[PDB]
Amino acid sequence: PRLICINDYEQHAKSVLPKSIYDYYRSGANDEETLADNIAAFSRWKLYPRMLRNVAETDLSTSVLGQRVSMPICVGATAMQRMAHVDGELATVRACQSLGTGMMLSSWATSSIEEVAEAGPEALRWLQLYIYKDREVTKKLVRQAEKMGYKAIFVTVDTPYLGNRLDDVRNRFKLPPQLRMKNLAAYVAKAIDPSISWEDIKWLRRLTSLPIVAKGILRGDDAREAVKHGLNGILVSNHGARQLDGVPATIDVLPEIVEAVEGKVEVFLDGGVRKGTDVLKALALGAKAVFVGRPIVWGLAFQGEKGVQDVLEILKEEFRLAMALSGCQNVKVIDKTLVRK
Amino acid sequence: PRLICINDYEQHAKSVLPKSIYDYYRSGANDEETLADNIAAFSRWKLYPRMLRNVAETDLSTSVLGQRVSMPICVGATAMQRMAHVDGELATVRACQSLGTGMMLSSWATSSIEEVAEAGPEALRWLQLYIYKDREVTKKLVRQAEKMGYKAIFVTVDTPYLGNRLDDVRNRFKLPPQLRMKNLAAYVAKAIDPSISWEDIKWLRRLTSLPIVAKGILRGDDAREAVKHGLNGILVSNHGARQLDGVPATIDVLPEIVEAVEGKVEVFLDGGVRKGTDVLKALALGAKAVFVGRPIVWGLAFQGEKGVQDVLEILKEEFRLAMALSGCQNVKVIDKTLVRK
Amino acid sequence: PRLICINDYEQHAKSVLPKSIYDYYRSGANDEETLADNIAAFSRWKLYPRMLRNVAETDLSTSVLGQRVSMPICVGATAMQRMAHVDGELATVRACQSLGTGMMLSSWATSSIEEVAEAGPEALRWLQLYIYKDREVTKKLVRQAEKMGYKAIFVTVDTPYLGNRLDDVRNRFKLPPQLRMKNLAAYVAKAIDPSISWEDIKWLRRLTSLPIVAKGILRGDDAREAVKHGLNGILVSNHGARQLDGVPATIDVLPEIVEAVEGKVEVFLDGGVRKGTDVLKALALGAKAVFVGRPIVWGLAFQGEKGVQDVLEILKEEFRLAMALSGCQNVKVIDKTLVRK
Amino acid sequence: PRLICINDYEQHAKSVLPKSIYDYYRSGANDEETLADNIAAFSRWKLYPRMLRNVAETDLSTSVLGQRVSMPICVGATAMQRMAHVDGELATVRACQSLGTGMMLSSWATSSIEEVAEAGPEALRWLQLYIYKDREVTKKLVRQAEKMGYKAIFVTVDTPYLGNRLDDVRNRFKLPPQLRMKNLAAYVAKAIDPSISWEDIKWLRRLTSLPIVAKGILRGDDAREAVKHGLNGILVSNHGARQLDGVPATIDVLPEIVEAVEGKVEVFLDGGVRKGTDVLKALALGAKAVFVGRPIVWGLAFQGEKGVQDVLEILKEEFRLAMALSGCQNVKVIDKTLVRK
Ligand SMILES: Cc1cc2nc3c(=O)[nH]c(=O)nc-3n(C[C@H](O)[C@H](O)[C@H](O)COP(=O)(O)O)c2cc1C
Ligand SMILES: Cc1cc2nc3c(=O)[nH]c(=O)nc-3n(C[C@H](O)[C@H](O)[C@H](O)COP(=O)(O)O)c2cc1C
Ligand SMILES: Cc1cc2nc3c(=O)[nH]c(=O)nc-3n(C[C@H](O)[C@H](O)[C@H](O)COP(=O)(O)O)c2cc1C
Ligand SMILES: Cc1cc2nc3c(=O)[nH]c(=O)nc-3n(C[C@H](O)[C@H](O)[C@H](O)COP(=O)(O)O)c2cc1C
Ligand SMILES: O=C(CSc1nc[nH]n1)N1CCN(c2cccc(Cl)c2)CC1
Ligand SMILES: O=C(CSc1nc[nH]n1)N1CCN(c2cccc(Cl)c2)CC1
Ligand SMILES: O=C(CSc1nc[nH]n1)N1CCN(c2cccc(Cl)c2)CC1
Ligand SMILES: O=C(CSc1nc[nH]n1)N1CCN(c2cccc(Cl)c2)CC1
């Protein structure tokens, strides 16, 4: 293989993965309107580059919730990574450690919170949390994250029930027989609490002093409520278009959310990030950093840790080039005048 | 067959029905611009879901013209259902009775008003009426509906003449030889009155104390006239895109009609409803309930009563999921802020 | 053949005509952007039909420049009709006489002004005129039209040079050897005057008392100048998209032109009329009548006079149905509220 | 071959050039969104032609930076023309001399500044300059241009680094073994200075009294800065969509730049010019002249000097026709009312 951009990695993954596994990772909810729009929406935002600014020294570094990262490009939570590669989440965290960026670990990982901390002790690591009907197991996951040097909790708030991904139903999706959630619609309905409310966010805010990011907010009123509840960031996310279909693209709702929080908390984005220009557009519209979901799984499917490292390095280099061609020597000078819809 | 969404049922129906029968049900008028737009328009309306609202208890129940239904999803009038399945309208009403929703019976049914009441005595049933040049047969249909416990009249107002559906002309459409309208362009021209005016609506309003819904209104001025004539609802309908081609999608004209009637009568929608999110969008824009036409015929073509039950259950479950993912525990909290075009 | 709409006639014509002849009639200028848009633009204008208006009696009759016609659908000038059928313009005028509508005869006809008057003595006939460098032959054509009972002059104003139709260049277009202009880019450059100005319109206005329509106006300022020069109508036309490519669709510029002339002269439209709803949209936006170009040639290619009669009857019937379904009993009640873009 | 429009020349070039060479010339950056939009954007600008203006005498002549040219259509800088035809830049300048238009010579030419002046002594010639890390070689190129009768410097300002053109990476692009830059991403990174700032523009303004045009400006604020630094024109350019992908089409940003410079310097356009109507639209929006890149390379690939002459003659004739059909006898009367988006 000669893979030189993120799409090439997806095409390689489709070629090597069983159909059911490829479909599980690629699929969006229902007719997949939002899945298409998470990508298409980035193309509608046009870039207005400044010339002659001195971009010999391009510095991609930034910080996420007070922790330094090498680039505003971080690994989002994607379940059951051992389906893509035998090393699964341990491959991913090692690549993140190499790159100097952070990994958000799925609550539905095929590797334990401790296993991932042991594989990536110097890596920036965060835990994505679902509030389970069993609040004891929920609390155990938070306490394990604290003990094992995870630096934030990303609480997923858009999944009271699992979205309806048709290909998983056609393929009756399940984990391969040798794998386990080491810490799907039927499983969520049995385990994930559809009752959670802002009162549960008050509970979680009381449970941990770790920073908490609300993941899956799409409305400014909800973002302002998250700020009121003492949370420390908002990840603007439509869950990779896998929950409610027909919501807007995340890049289209990002400006409303940035306006609504009035700088009180960091705002992040995921959904459809494939290219360095996507990263640049998200930062111009006020995101501190973006998260990538599917591209990491395609990296694993190609070559485990090295394939994840390659995907992150391609995004890093595309982002550096996009910054340099736009006249940006660092992330602090990426401003709103760089983009227009 | 493994049919898990309404499109799958259409694909199955195309596979099993004779071409002329499939084309009769699928076809729209002329170049079928409105037929495409009734579906496309739903995709342009984007959903803005609220998180963390407590959706453990989702209640889909509502009422139509004062009668309770299990869901805001009802069966619209589609002619000559015995072409799709031997049990035709009797299969449909039995499924409606099972589901707890209502059936609008076509004036051009392959089963009599009494036959359908006998098959579905506990089912909520309404009669769709055409004003025939023969006012005696028109009055006989209304009196039969009253005697047989139908609960409303839906008077179709957009069919002074039949629309021009090219495939029916190519196929010279007729009923199979064993079937009869037990109570097509050539038939309408011989039987349906192209002279009807608001004076005929005054006549019908005087004829029955049953609630009367005007079906096929697309303009706010006409909706206000229907309110002035003492009618009890408006079904925003372009007749499944089979009459005048190039009218707007019903979801696009629904907000004008809801504004125009100022809450004086219930407003309903049909045309292009295929998914639970379509139902949610229509209710967010102020419809009390929606009607489905073609999907019911595809249910019959698959397995008669069980196929209609399956299609209604798929719509019910998609609608519950869409409500839950949007933060709606019941239909009363589905508000206009959930959608933006 | 079973031809039931105008597109079917085009498909039949492509099947029976030599490629060069089909391409000559079908082609637009350059990349054919306007050719596509003359049709696409009609689909963007949506219809807002009134219900319950009494359309038992639909009267399609109107008048063009004071002469009664059976329908607001008239035959536009298309050159060299004997390439499509041996009877050419004589077939066309006979069909117009049968239908009770008017024929605009091309200055580049394969039949003489007298021949066409002899074939269609009771037909409403107008002459389309090019101002030739030879003003004597120009004056001879006008005087012949007057002597032979033609009722107006349509002076084409958008052709100082011929547009560049690539397929004609690829096919090195010429008349078949047995045919003559009985009264192409190379021919225009030799014969049509690229110098004509409003001073030539003053000359033509002085030459004849016949009504004069300016054909090919696309700007309101030019329409107001035509009114100032004493002309009696404006045919909003982009020459069937065969002159300057990238001009707007005629249905899109029609409202500006109707506004600009402030009711001082009749406004007509051609370009992309294929369906009765196209006619209805043009009249709702203020055109008195529309002209059809290519559909008449496809009628000839099918069956000469009978094929032209069939195409005109299909347009008539589609227009009646569109009027009836929109609530219009006559052309005088077709109003601007029937359409929105 | 029968090539009658610029697209035909591209199709011919794809048929005769090695894939890597065709791809080098055709390719845009990354997903090639801007490459598509440079063409698509021209089609969105519609023309509003005036009739009856007297276009017997069409005069295409204009001036660029005070030098007369035969048409507002000039040859832009395209590297390494000897890859397309053995005579490369010498063929191009000879064709420019024949046509009476100007040639912008690439700093990355396969022919020297002196060689091209020797082949085209009477041709209007300008030098496109990159500011190399080696300011001595930069100054040598400027002094050579002055000594050899070049009339302006076009300083490229949008290339601190080379854009990422995927096909060149797939094909590991290099010059054929017999060719040299007689005066690619890896080469730029080694030779082109990513540090250049407006201070380097002050240096260049001090170095030469020749007119200097800033090539690659896309923002009005940058255009105003170029005016402040004493430059003499702005070439609105996205580098043929080969640098930052997702910038707007040049025809879409041209009006902002023309407004921003308030007539203080000439404004030019390149990017997507293929047709005479493209030239007309650019002049209506205020460009003095346009530059063509790829079409010249396709002319060379067809037949060297004669193929470049043919492409320039096709553009000239399409432009004359577009001017004549729009009512423009000369370039001075091409006004903003001819276009609307
Ligand atoms: C295969 C797959 C599994 C996912 N698993 C989880 C999960 O365990 N937890 C979670 O909160 N989100 C999960 N998501 C959502 C991602 O965190 C993220 O929002 C999404 O992948 C971003 O969009 P992208 O894939 O377009 O980059 C998953 C997404 C995918 C594609
Ligand atoms: C096959 C077919 C038959 C129909 N028959 C009738 C009819 O008898 N009476 C009526 O008022 N509308 C009739 N309609 C219109 C439907 O009541 C309804 O407006 C339409 O089907 C809704 O759109 P949908 O098919 O996209 O759900 C018919 C529609 C179809 C597709
Ligand atoms: C084959 C062809 C020949 C034409 N010949 C003439 C002509 O002789 N005189 C003229 O003024 N316009 C001529 N036109 C333009 C037509 O009068 C008319 O503007 C155009 O056909 C209308 O668009 P339609 O073909 O889409 O109906 C011609 C058009 C076509 C397609
Ligand atoms: C093959 C190729 C080589 C180019 N080489 C150069 C170059 O040497 N210098 C430069 O400033 N721009 C260069 N450009 C950009 C062109 O000057 C010009 O901006 C662009 O070709 C215009 O768009 P067009 O190709 O759509 O006409 C190049 C473009 C192409 C396609
Ligand atoms: O809420 C529940 C069960 S509630 C219930 N109701 C009926 N049966 N069970 N838990 C979810 C979290 N928990 C977990 C989280 C991640 C991975 C693993 Cl192993 C475990 C599983 C169990
Ligand atoms: O208006 C008419 C006939 S008027 C007329 N003019 C010339 N011949 N007939 N009726 C329509 C309603 N009627 C009906 C409605 C539904 C089904 C059945 Cl069987 C019957 C049929 C007959
Ligand atoms: O203006 C001219 C010729 S001017 C000229 N310059 C150099 N050679 N000729 N006429 C055009 C009208 N005329 C005509 C119009 C329609 C059909 C027929 Cl047969 C004839 C042909 C001749
Ligand atoms: O800036 C440099 C080299 S700077 C450097 N750093 C490490 N190695 N070299 N020059 C560029 C211009 N120059 C040129 C311009 C056009 C063609 C030709 Cl032959 C030559 C080549 C060399």
mmCIF file of C-alpha atoms in Angstrom, chain B residues 12-172:
data_model
loop_
_atom_site.group_PDB
_atom_site.id
_atom_site.type_symbol
_atom_site.label_atom_id
_atom_site.label_comp_id
_atom_site.label_asym_id
_atom_site.label_seq_id
_atom_site.Cartn_x
_atom_site.Cartn_y
_atom_site.Cartn_z
ATOM 1 C CA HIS B 12 -39.528 -5.935 -1.719
ATOM 2 C CA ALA B 13 -42.829 -4.725 -3.257
ATOM 3 C CA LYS B 14 -41.108 -3.834 -6.591
ATOM 4 C CA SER B 15 -39.681 -7.396 -6.575
ATOM 5 C CA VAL B 16 -43.095 -9.174 -6.094
ATOM 6 C CA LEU B 17 -45.775 -6.888 -7.707
ATOM 7 C CA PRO B 18 -46.580 -6.774 -11.438
ATOM 8 C CA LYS B 19 -44.906 -3.636 -12.984
ATOM 9 C CA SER B 20 -48.308 -1.935 -13.731
ATOM 10 C CA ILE B 21 -49.467 -2.363 -10.101
ATOM 11 C CA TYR B 22 -46.096 -1.259 -8.586
ATOM 12 C CA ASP B 23 -46.073 1.740 -11.019
ATOM 13 C CA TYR B 24 -49.691 2.650 -10.135
ATOM 14 C CA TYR B 25 -48.752 2.920 -6.425
ATOM 15 C CA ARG B 26 -45.253 4.436 -6.872
ATOM 16 C CA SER B 27 -46.044 6.997 -9.559
ATOM 17 C CA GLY B 28 -46.371 10.761 -9.124
ATOM 18 C CA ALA B 29 -47.728 13.267 -11.731
ATOM 19 C CA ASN B 30 -45.800 14.194 -14.884
ATOM 20 C CA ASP B 31 -42.022 14.491 -14.294
ATOM 21 C CA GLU B 32 -42.455 13.594 -10.598
ATOM 22 C CA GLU B 33 -40.646 16.695 -9.292
ATOM 23 C CA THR B 34 -42.912 16.989 -6.263
ATOM 24 C CA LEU B 35 -42.632 13.181 -5.649
ATOM 25 C CA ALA B 36 -38.859 13.560 -5.231
ATOM 26 C CA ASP B 37 -39.238 16.783 -3.174
ATOM 27 C CA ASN B 38 -41.734 15.293 -0.656
ATOM 28 C CA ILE B 39 -38.779 13.138 0.497
ATOM 29 C CA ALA B 40 -35.887 15.568 -0.167
ATOM 30 C CA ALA B 41 -37.586 18.384 1.752
ATOM 31 C CA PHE B 42 -37.577 16.358 4.975
ATOM 32 C CA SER B 43 -33.784 15.992 4.690
ATOM 33 C CA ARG B 44 -33.355 19.830 4.482
ATOM 34 C CA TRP B 45 -35.052 20.289 7.856
ATOM 35 C CA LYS B 46 -32.301 19.667 10.445
ATOM 36 C CA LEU B 47 -32.891 18.490 14.016
ATOM 37 C CA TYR B 48 -31.495 20.285 17.091
ATOM 38 C CA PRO B 49 -31.816 17.645 19.860
ATOM 39 C CA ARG B 50 -31.823 18.464 23.555
ATOM 40 C CA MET B 51 -29.682 16.246 25.801
ATOM 41 C CA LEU B 52 -30.126 15.045 29.380
ATOM 42 C CA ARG B 53 -33.951 15.364 29.527
ATOM 43 C CA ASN B 54 -34.933 11.894 30.968
ATOM 44 C CA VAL B 55 -36.389 9.772 28.144
ATOM 45 C CA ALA B 56 -36.726 6.440 30.022
ATOM 46 C CA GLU B 57 -40.500 6.747 29.628
ATOM 47 C CA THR B 58 -41.329 7.708 26.044
ATOM 48 C CA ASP B 59 -45.097 8.153 25.517
ATOM 49 C CA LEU B 60 -46.048 8.335 21.805
ATOM 50 C CA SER B 61 -49.826 8.643 22.405
ATOM 51 C CA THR B 62 -51.819 11.604 21.116
ATOM 52 C CA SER B 63 -55.288 12.360 19.849
ATOM 53 C CA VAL B 64 -56.744 13.015 16.386
ATOM 54 C CA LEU B 65 -60.027 15.045 16.322
ATOM 55 C CA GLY B 66 -60.591 14.090 20.016
ATOM 56 C CA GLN B 67 -59.965 10.307 19.607
ATOM 57 C CA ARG B 68 -56.915 8.760 21.343
ATOM 58 C CA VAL B 69 -54.290 7.033 19.183
ATOM 59 C CA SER B 70 -51.140 5.133 20.219
ATOM 60 C CA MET B 71 -48.854 7.293 18.026
ATOM 61 C CA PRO B 72 -49.163 10.382 15.774
ATOM 62 C CA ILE B 73 -48.811 8.076 12.724
ATOM 63 C CA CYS B 74 -52.010 7.069 10.940
ATOM 64 C CA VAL B 75 -52.926 5.226 7.710
ATOM 65 C CA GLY B 76 -53.863 7.489 4.806
ATOM 66 C CA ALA B 77 -56.339 6.654 2.037
ATOM 67 C CA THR B 78 -54.806 4.610 -0.793
ATOM 68 C CA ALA B 79 -57.148 3.193 -3.442
ATOM 69 C CA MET B 80 -57.671 -0.403 -4.453
ATOM 70 C CA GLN B 81 -55.539 -2.143 -1.766
ATOM 71 C CA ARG B 82 -56.721 -5.623 -2.946
ATOM 72 C CA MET B 83 -54.344 -5.144 -5.921
ATOM 73 C CA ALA B 84 -51.446 -5.454 -3.387
ATOM 74 C CA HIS B 85 -52.829 -8.294 -1.235
ATOM 75 C CA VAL B 86 -56.002 -10.473 -1.398
ATOM 76 C CA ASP B 87 -57.192 -9.090 2.028
ATOM 77 C CA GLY B 88 -56.596 -5.425 0.950
ATOM 78 C CA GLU B 89 -58.365 -2.903 3.252
ATOM 79 C CA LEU B 90 -59.449 -5.640 5.717
ATOM 80 C CA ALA B 91 -55.755 -6.489 6.344
ATOM 81 C CA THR B 92 -55.034 -2.751 6.800
ATOM 82 C CA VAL B 93 -57.805 -2.077 9.342
ATOM 83 C CA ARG B 94 -56.877 -5.179 11.379
ATOM 84 C CA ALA B 95 -53.275 -3.901 11.614
ATOM 85 C CA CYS B 96 -54.510 -0.441 12.640
ATOM 86 C CA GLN B 97 -56.663 -2.074 15.376
ATOM 87 C CA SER B 98 -53.574 -4.020 16.605
ATOM 88 C CA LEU B 99 -51.422 -0.863 16.659
ATOM 89 C CA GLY B 100 -54.068 1.425 18.240
ATOM 90 C CA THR B 101 -53.969 3.924 15.349
ATOM 91 C CA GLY B 102 -56.512 5.100 12.801
ATOM 92 C CA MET B 103 -57.271 4.140 9.246
ATOM 93 C CA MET B 104 -58.526 6.570 6.619
ATOM 94 C CA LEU B 105 -60.573 4.474 4.161
ATOM 95 C CA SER B 106 -60.477 5.455 0.477
ATOM 96 C CA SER B 107 -63.706 6.266 -1.354
ATOM 97 C CA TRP B 108 -62.094 4.052 -4.086
ATOM 98 C CA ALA B 109 -61.565 1.062 -1.835
ATOM 99 C CA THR B 110 -61.741 -2.610 -2.997
ATOM 100 C CA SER B 111 -63.720 -3.229 0.298
ATOM 101 C CA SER B 112 -67.059 -1.651 1.394
ATOM 102 C CA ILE B 113 -67.472 0.818 4.307
ATOM 103 C CA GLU B 114 -69.438 -1.931 6.144
ATOM 104 C CA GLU B 115 -66.836 -4.706 5.308
ATOM 105 C CA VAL B 116 -64.037 -2.587 6.809
ATOM 106 C CA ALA B 117 -66.100 -1.712 9.980
ATOM 107 C CA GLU B 118 -66.883 -5.479 10.341
ATOM 108 C CA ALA B 119 -63.119 -6.413 10.038
ATOM 109 C CA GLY B 120 -61.986 -3.598 12.435
ATOM 110 C CA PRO B 121 -64.914 -2.845 14.792
ATOM 111 C CA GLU B 122 -62.652 -1.517 17.587
ATOM 112 C CA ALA B 123 -60.353 0.302 15.146
ATOM 113 C CA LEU B 124 -60.414 4.095 14.771
ATOM 114 C CA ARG B 125 -61.695 4.575 11.215
ATOM 115 C CA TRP B 126 -62.360 7.650 9.066
ATOM 116 C CA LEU B 127 -63.788 7.939 5.534
ATOM 117 C CA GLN B 128 -62.040 9.784 2.736
ATOM 118 C CA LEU B 129 -64.717 11.266 0.487
ATOM 119 C CA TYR B 130 -64.756 12.544 -3.058
ATOM 120 C CA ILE B 131 -67.761 14.753 -3.947
ATOM 121 C CA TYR B 132 -69.208 12.804 -6.876
ATOM 122 C CA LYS B 133 -71.321 14.457 -9.540
ATOM 123 C CA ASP B 134 -74.028 12.110 -8.069
ATOM 124 C CA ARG B 135 -74.708 13.865 -4.717
ATOM 125 C CA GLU B 136 -77.051 10.960 -3.770
ATOM 126 C CA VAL B 137 -74.199 8.433 -3.833
ATOM 127 C CA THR B 138 -72.012 11.059 -2.035
ATOM 128 C CA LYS B 139 -74.645 11.423 0.759
ATOM 129 C CA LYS B 140 -75.042 7.551 0.914
ATOM 130 C CA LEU B 141 -71.261 7.199 1.614
ATOM 131 C CA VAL B 142 -71.444 9.829 4.436
ATOM 132 C CA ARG B 143 -74.553 8.218 5.984
ATOM 133 C CA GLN B 144 -72.905 4.721 5.762
ATOM 134 C CA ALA B 145 -69.742 6.082 7.500
ATOM 135 C CA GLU B 146 -71.961 7.560 10.314
ATOM 136 C CA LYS B 147 -73.996 4.298 10.702
ATOM 137 C CA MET B 148 -70.804 2.155 10.724
ATOM 138 C CA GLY B 149 -68.976 4.143 13.478
ATOM 139 C CA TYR B 150 -66.471 6.061 11.348
ATOM 140 C CA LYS B 151 -65.321 9.126 13.294
ATOM 141 C CA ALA B 152 -64.548 11.763 10.633
ATOM 142 C CA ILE B 153 -64.835 12.627 6.953
ATOM 143 C CA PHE B 154 -61.664 13.627 5.060
ATOM 144 C CA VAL B 155 -62.942 15.455 2.002
ATOM 145 C CA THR B 156 -60.349 15.467 -0.781
ATOM 146 C CA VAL B 157 -60.313 18.972 -2.341
ATOM 147 C CA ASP B 158 -57.346 18.769 -4.778
ATOM 148 C CA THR B 159 -58.850 16.370 -7.382
ATOM 149 C CA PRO B 160 -61.378 18.170 -9.659
ATOM 150 C CA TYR B 161 -59.658 16.023 -12.319
ATOM 151 C CA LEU B 162 -57.094 13.212 -11.919
ATOM 152 C CA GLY B 163 -53.429 14.127 -12.267
ATOM 153 C CA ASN B 164 -51.505 12.831 -15.273
ATOM 154 C CA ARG B 165 -49.369 9.878 -14.106
ATOM 155 C CA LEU B 166 -47.408 8.874 -17.241
ATOM 156 C CA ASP B 167 -46.690 5.249 -16.260
ATOM 157 C CA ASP B 168 -50.499 4.554 -15.895
ATOM 158 C CA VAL B 169 -51.016 5.926 -19.467
ATOM 159 C CA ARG B 170 -48.054 3.810 -20.799
ATOM 160 C CA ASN B 171 -49.552 0.747 -18.966
ATOM 161 C CA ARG B 172 -53.243 1.839 -19.756
#
